[PDB]
Amino acid sequence: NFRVYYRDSPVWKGPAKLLEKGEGAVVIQDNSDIKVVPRRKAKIIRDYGKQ
Amino acid sequence: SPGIWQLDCTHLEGKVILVAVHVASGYIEAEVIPAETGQETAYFLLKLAGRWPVKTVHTDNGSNFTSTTVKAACWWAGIKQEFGVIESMNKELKKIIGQVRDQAEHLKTAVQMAVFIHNKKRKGYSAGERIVDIIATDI
Amino acid sequence: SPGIWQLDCTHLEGKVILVAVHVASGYIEAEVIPAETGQETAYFLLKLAGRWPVKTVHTDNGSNFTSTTVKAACWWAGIKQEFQGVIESMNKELKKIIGQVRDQAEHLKTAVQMAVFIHNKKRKGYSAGERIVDIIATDIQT
Amino acid sequence: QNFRVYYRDSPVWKGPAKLLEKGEGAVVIQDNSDIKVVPRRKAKIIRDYG
Numbered sequence: 095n096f097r098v099y100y101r102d103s104p105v106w107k108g109p110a111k112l113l114e115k116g117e118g119a120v121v122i123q124d125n126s127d128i129k130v131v132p133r134r135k136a137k138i139i140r141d142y143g144k145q
Numbered sequence: 146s147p148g149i150w151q152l153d154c155t156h157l158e159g160k161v162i163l164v165a166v167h168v169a170s171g172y173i174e175a176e177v178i179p180a181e182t183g184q185e186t187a188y189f190l191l192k193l194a195g196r197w198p199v200k201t202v203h204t205d206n207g208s209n210f211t212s213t214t215v216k217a218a219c220w221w222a223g224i225k226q227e228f229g230v231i232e233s234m235n236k237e238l239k240k241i242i243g244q245v246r247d248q249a250e251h252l253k254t255a256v257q258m259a260v261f262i263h264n265k266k267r268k269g270y271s272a273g274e275r276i277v278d279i280i281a282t283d284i
Numbered sequence: 285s286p287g288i289w290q291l292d293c294t295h296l297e298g299k300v301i302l303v304a305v306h307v308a309s310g311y312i313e314a315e316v317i318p319a320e321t322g323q324e325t326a327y328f329l330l331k332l333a334g335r336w337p338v339k340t341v342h343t344d345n346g347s348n349f350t351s352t353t354v355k356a357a358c359w360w361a362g363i364k365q366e367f368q369g370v371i372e373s374m375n376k377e378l379k380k381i382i383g384q385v386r387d388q389a390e391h392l393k394t395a396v397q398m399a400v401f402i403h404n405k406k407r408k409g410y411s412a413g414e415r416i417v418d419i420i421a422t423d424i425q426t
Numbered sequence: 427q428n429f430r431v432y433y434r435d436s437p438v439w440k441g442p443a444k445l446l447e448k449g450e451g452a453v454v455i456q457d458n459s460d461i462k463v464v465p466r467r468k469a470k471i472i473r474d475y476g
């Protein structure tokens with residue numbers, strides 16, 4: 095339902111699987127790697143045109 | 146299919162022209178973007194998606210169409226991406242642009258005049274009439 | 285009437301938002317213009333006119349809508365200008381949806397087009413985008 | 427039916443004006459009841475489309 099786009103360290107990377115959303119960070123899986131990204135550096139985008 | 150679109154960029158006078166075509170009707174939308182980037186391409190798709198039932202967009206492997214910014218726009222708007230109707234349409238667009246180029250100072254004005262002429266020319270319906278007919282029939 | 289539109293400008297974050305609304309359907313188009321000038325208004329109308337059967341546009345007495353450059357665009361595209369308050373209620377509706385989704389995007393122009401998407405696709409029954417296509421195609425097919 | 431010409435001769439674009447002739451460097455127009463000669467670069471000749 096959701097997809098997460100994020101920046102490490104400038105170019106936006108993604109889409110990545112959303113595993114968990116916290117108060118100050120989000121846990122995602124981009125390909126085969128699990129990453130912990132701060133909220134300010136991640137965009138969680140819902141598929142709105144579908145549903 | 147009423148929801149199939151083709152997007153590609155063409156260039157004139159050193160400027161970038163992003164052209165979208167409704168394949169089933171030949172209706173076109175065009176915009177002069179300040180840079181051929183994924184951010185400008187994604188912003189173009191958002192405007193297109195909120196306007197027509199955009200289900201599938203077919204582009205080449207340009208770095209602006211394969212960018213992450215476009216993937217987020219297509220995902221949010223519910224658009225599927227696939228990687229010569231648009232290329233033949235760019236030739237038609239540049240033809241009409243040259244016919245009206247001297248009538249305006251800015252290239253972007255001649256572009257929108259050319260899109261106007263294309264979408265309103267009958268044969269019989271015009272391209273602008275066909276896309277509205279096709280989409281309303283699908284509803 | 286399928287060819288009546290209303291255009292007006294609203295402001296958010298110091299930027300100018302030019303909004304066009306199809307009165308019969310409530311369908312809207314919006315674009316962030318770099319300046320509230322007649323040249324940007326006329327370029328917006330050309331894009332609008334080559335897209336829908338734009339026959340009459342209702343605006344206020346702003347110096348950008350009464351400019352000569354807009355008159356030339358309307359004459360070339362065959363548009364008549366007139367100077368229910370649909371656009372004023374629509375500016376509130378657009379800015380309402382913009383504020384609801386503003387944090388989802390960096391650029392204001394992105395939130396603008398998301399809000400236009402949300403408005404034209406919302407069912408409450410046809411949607412705004414479905415009504416304008418239904419109204420215009422009915423006039424074409426008949 | 428015919429054409430309209432928009433022109434500047436001091437600021438704000440003036441017109442529409444009747445088109446009489448288009449030259450290499452000037453255009454002969456009639457704005458209302460007055461005959462004017464305007465350079466090409468200060469005149470927009472727009473064909474009646476739509």
Ligand SMILES: Cc1ccc(C2CC2)c(-c2ccc3c(c2C)CCCO3)c1[C@H](OC1CC1)C(=O)O
Pocket residue numbers: 099100106137139184185187188191213214215217218219221388389390391392394395398
């Ligand atoms: C500046 C910027 C950088 C990265 C991205 C995407 C991959 C992460 C976007 C972007 C693009 C499309 C889109 C959304 C966003 C967030 C969210 C909802 C609707 O579809 C943007 C965007 O600008 C672009 C639109 C012209 C913005 O304003 O944030």
Ligand SMILES: Cc1ccc(C2CC2)c(-c2ccc3c(c2C)CCCO3)c1[C@H](OC1CC1)C(=O)O
Pocket residue numbers: 248249250251252254255258323324326327330352353354356357358360432439470472
């Ligand atoms: C820069 C400029 C100054 C004056 C005018 C108007 C006074 C007569 C125009 C203009 C406006 C509308 C229009 C046409 C033109 C020539 C031609 C045919 C189609 O409708 C422009 C125009 O820029 C505007 C369009 C954004 C341009 O690029 O010349």
Ligand SMILES: [Cl-]
Pocket residue numbers: 116117118119120
């Ligand atoms: Cl956390």
Ligand SMILES: [Mg+2]
Pocket residue numbers: 153154205207
């Ligand atoms: Mg290409």
Ligand SMILES: [Mg+2]
Pocket residue numbers: 292293344346
């Ligand atoms: Mg106003």
